[PDB]
């Protein structure tokens, strides 16, 4: 269907169109001119009149022309960045398209043959059209950024990729801020309880919660020699039977108590008032708790944001470390390929704060590829995400954003966001985004399907 | 009613008018084109004239025409924001209005529907019409940031908020810097006294205010020690003068700590009460709970606050997880005077607390409200957290600019028209509403005592 | 064969071009006027008409006008970089070429003097023409940059550079991120294990690694000397418990030392080996010595690829002073994912080396070549070193930007184009060419392995 034709000038990624029918972003269409066929997106579309302008200042000239029947001349106009050509393997067009070069609504066939057979988890479809877009699962190994303002869709869009994915046999890690997911009726749904097991830390780790560096060489000696002996000790315990699981955290305490000294001792007894909710020798290994083809979620529910980072940034490591065992030695560690996603990420991901789940962000950020394991950050705030974190998310579900400053940040922490993609962040709507990154074969503009079930508020009564 | 009709270009959310009746910034408008019912908001108006023009010269020829009757052409043109299409459940215009697009004034049933319907506390009306406006309660969970500049109506919002709020059974804390609710005839009004109980205190706490932390790592371990014996007897035992005796006889080490203690119990003298009950017990559902920090110094008045914050978090922390223990009912927090407390360049205990509120508040039922004229004074990690905002008079554009990158859902032209708005009026946004509102605020029916002090005496 | 005409104004590094063929970015042209034969490159191209302009409105007019048979005016308008002067001796042309002089496309002899006769190693062709692309060998002891944006062809060029390299008798040392090298059917392909050796190791890099220097000063005597002490002791003698078990014996402060050293064995458990050879040893001439990196940490990764710069760099420098001592050859380490390891938010051992290299390997035959995605995330000090910068599609400008000022030989109008460019192209710069080359890429006719892994499982 013919919509419009090009007028004044193009390039060979930007041409101008006057529509005969009315047209919208996220609208493809095609451009077909010499032996080129290109593929082109509607981005701002504008309407005026040559007649009733912006210099036209008499209010009676228009009152009696509405008196009329349709005897005012009006027009619409179409931005459309050229985005490849089919003809030539989905490259560049080599060559602008001449002035009056006919432009119509793209096929079924032609869409699909782009956004959905490179793909395989569905997370909606085009804006008007019947064509589902299908995003590729390896290229997720180059993380994903899921970023949009207050309440446009960004839980959803987790919802609908954890199932999808789950349900081609794929295994996702949710850290739950809100507990959304949680005590929802996502289909393979895997609840998980924060816990921490020092029985599964390391003597660095151990260190790092109690803030005590490990180029502190006095206070790590201490440290380290003490928790390998108590630790140790507690483990020859319970092979020996000489410690009951009813006493173990108490007996836990004081061992550590006796084996240390005075900075360790404060750091000591301030780790265990601060993370007392959360420390927990009887429950098993993250890794044993995470389980294949089903979405495994962690509540944080009702932590607060120290717990918080200590959790996350544990499970994390235990991830990265077991991962990279498995390749190593394909006998132990983690079987299968994960997915973490990091909701609220802007309180973990700051720049201008040191937490450390940004350490153990960056890590699988930098390695995660290699050892199959993919991060997913969502946040409402990109420019409170740091620079470094968020320029290594290849991949990105931006939904709308309409601060500026947002969009700009966004733009120089990617690679392949184009500035003119990046103006009309504006103009999506709720479960509407731009999805850009190695998921897709192309920029995609797509309508993201709602969840079937149902996710919990995270608005809580007011009044009680 | 008919008052105008779209001139030149327009876009799916922007739109010019050129008008019949006089408009002004707030006011509501229809445009009713093909299928789309298009709800837009009038922002900047503007006046003109074909005949006497910018380049017109010659003062005798305009002088002439002042003789005549009525002989001088003149146009009124405004700006519309485009904001949702009510035809298509409220989403965004698809398809931008043909010009010669008539412009009616939206009825009061529309913006109803849209402003008054989805919220329980009012706030006012809209401006030129009598349409209520609700805010949703449930959303104040995300938090709120009231701004402005001085004298356009923080505390008078704060007041009618407050009021409301309580007598739909929903509780407030107020901390007062200037006394201002403290002593008035606000309804439900709960009188607190600046108190500080080491009773109620954690050793973190309680080492921080000595001025004890990583500066004396063997001071820490000797003050720990004795603090937690001495209150583990006391609460045992279960008093000012007990306390300190204790604290002295407990503990050149000992002596480091005991005189930092000594001038501890100095300078917060006027603040420490052992026998004071814990802030927790003393704040009564459904009232008007006001702090008074009217004859605080700033130590003691960071003190009190960072601790009845910490207190309040943790208790609505502990009834979440236990539910038989802490803070039984939801409460909102308002920090009046926030960029004393939340400046960016200075690091004190209320800040490390209200960006704890920020980012944990919302799970445990613990609102935070912050009021104040100095936006840019206030750090951007807990004004960026405030989902919801209501914004009065701004005129400088830095502040604009700073509250804009503070806020996700705050458009660059409604942030331009912040310079325009009156005494009283405000942009309201956030999800306490379904639209961007600009309001006339409700002045409040009582009488909240004065904030300048008589600077010359009798 | 005429393409076009100069039109309007010309400078005498820029000028404008009325076409009668097609042309594209990348497209040499030869401009003969006066005793000036100039050789330009065309950049920008747009298209546009008399008629159906920017401010056409009326669609029906449009649309009559399809009826009949090419009743539209169109033209091609492109701009050229004016290169050089191939009569005065390939300098810059000293005068702007005329209005309504003729542009012709260069021809194939003329190219391949420029392109072909001064290099050695090649990379493609140019876009278009069919004339080959060869590289300046010795060239590349001033070191390369390979950047573009992800899946443009980085490794592809690494590929096919290091194959020609090695035909030719070369050395290539690639440090694998993801083992796309190690397991493929590259030629002269000789595959290297990452080992670290303690006894190929000095009391500094040792000390580094145990994480013991400044910090611990008492520690760092004890260290060193028991270090040199043993590992004296080994080399004497000429084994990893044996190294261990002496170590442990030649050791509060020294427990401080056995604690970290304890460690050490653990954390670098996977990669250290008395038994394995100096890697100066294990590096074959005329082969492409590839290191797998694929199944290390971040810390041994960074450890082993700062050991191996470390010993090739003074490897090199013993045998220029020597000559009876050190590597033989000169050899090019080509850094993978480089945006890893020379973030300048960031201090590694890797970005210590590989500055060290930059700065000296021109001096010793160490060359070196750095492969990223991420430009702004690679130090300033280190990229702009890499004299020459093969740069494929990059389309965020401030990626450019930072690209332009870490290059003294790039031109802002070369930069613009950079978001033209599609896989497989490339501007490449620097001594490695005679001109600035728009090259299409040669496709690496083996196999790399896959750097996307199963995301599902089995
Ligand atoms: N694809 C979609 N289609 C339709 N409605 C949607 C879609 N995505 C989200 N919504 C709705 O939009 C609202 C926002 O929900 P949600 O998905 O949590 O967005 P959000 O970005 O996580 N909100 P927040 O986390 O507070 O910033 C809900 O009412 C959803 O039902
Ligand atoms: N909605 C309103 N309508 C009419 N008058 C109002 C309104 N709100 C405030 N006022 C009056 O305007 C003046 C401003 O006082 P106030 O309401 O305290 O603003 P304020 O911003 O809190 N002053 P300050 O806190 O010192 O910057 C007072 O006389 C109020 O009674
Ligand atoms: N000169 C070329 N001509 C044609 N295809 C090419 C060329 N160079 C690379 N490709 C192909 O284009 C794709 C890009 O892969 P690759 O060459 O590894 O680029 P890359 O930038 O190194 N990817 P990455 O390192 O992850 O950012 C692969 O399918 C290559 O086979
Ligand atoms: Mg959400
Ligand atoms: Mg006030
Ligand atoms: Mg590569």
Not at 176 to 192: F, Q
Not at 290 to 296: A, C, F, I
Request: aromatic share 6%; with cysteine; proline share 3%.
């Amino acid at each position: 269907m013919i919509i419009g034709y090009v007028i004044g000038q193009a390039t060979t990624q930007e041409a101008l169109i006057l529509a005969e029918r009315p047209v919208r972003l996220g609208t493809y269409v095609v451009l077909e001119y010499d032996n080129v066929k290109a593929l082109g997106l509607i981005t701002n579309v504008t309407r005026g009149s040559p007649l009733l302008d912006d210099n036209m200042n008499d209010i009676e000239i228009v009152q009696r022309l509405k008196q009329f029947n349709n005897s005012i001349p009006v027009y619409t106009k179409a931005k459309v960045k050229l985005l490849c050509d089919m003809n030539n393997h989905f490259l560049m067009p080599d060559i602008p398209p001449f002035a009056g070069t006919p432009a119509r609504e793209a096929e079924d066939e032609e869409l699909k043959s782009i956004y959905s057979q490179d793909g395989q988890i569905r997370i909606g479809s085009l804006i008007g059209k019947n064509v589902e877009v299908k995003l590729n699962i390896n290229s997720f190994a180059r993380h994903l950024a899921i970023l949009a303002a207050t309440g446009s869709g960004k839980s959803n869009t987790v919802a609908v990729l954890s199932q999808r994915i789950s349900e081609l046999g794929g295994s996702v890690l949710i850290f739950d801020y809100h507990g959304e997911y949680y005590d929802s009726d996502i289909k393979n749904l895997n609840r998980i309880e924060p816990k921490l097991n020092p029985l599964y830390m390391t003597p660095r780790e151990f260190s790092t919660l109690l803030e005590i560096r490990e180029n502190a060489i006095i206070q790590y000696r201490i440290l380290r020699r003490a928790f390998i002996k108590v630790t140790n000790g507690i483990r020859a315990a319970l092979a020996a039977g000489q410690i009951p699981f009813s006493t173990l955290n108490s007996q836990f305490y004081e061992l550590m108590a006796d084996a240390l000294k005075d900075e360790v001792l404060n750091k000591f007894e301030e780790f265990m008032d601060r993370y007392s909710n959360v420390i927990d020798l009887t429950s098993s290994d993250i890794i044993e708790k995470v389980k294949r083809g089903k979405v495994n979620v962690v509540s944080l529910t009702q932590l607060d944001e120290d717990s918080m980072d200590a959790v996350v940034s544990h499970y994390l490591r235990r991830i990265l470390d077991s991962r990279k065992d498995f390749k190593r030695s394909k006998n132990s560690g983690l079987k299968f390929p994960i997915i973490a996603v990091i909701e609220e990420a802007h309180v973990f991901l700051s720049k201008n704060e040191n937490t450390l789940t940004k350490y153990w962000a960056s890590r699988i950020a930098r390695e995660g590829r290699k050892f199959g394991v993919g991060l997913t950050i969502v946040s409402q705030r990109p420019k409170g995400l740091d620079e470094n974190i968020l320029s290594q998310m290849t991949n990105k579900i931006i939904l709308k954003i309409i601060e500026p400053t947002d969009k700009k940040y966004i733009l120089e922490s990617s690679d392949n966001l184009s500035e003119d993609l990046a103006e009309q962040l504006s103009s999506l709507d709720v479960g509407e985004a731009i999805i850009i990154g190695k998921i897709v074969k192309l920029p995609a503009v797509v309508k993201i399907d709602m969840f079937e079930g149902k996710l919990l508020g995270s608005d809580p009564d007011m009044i009680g």
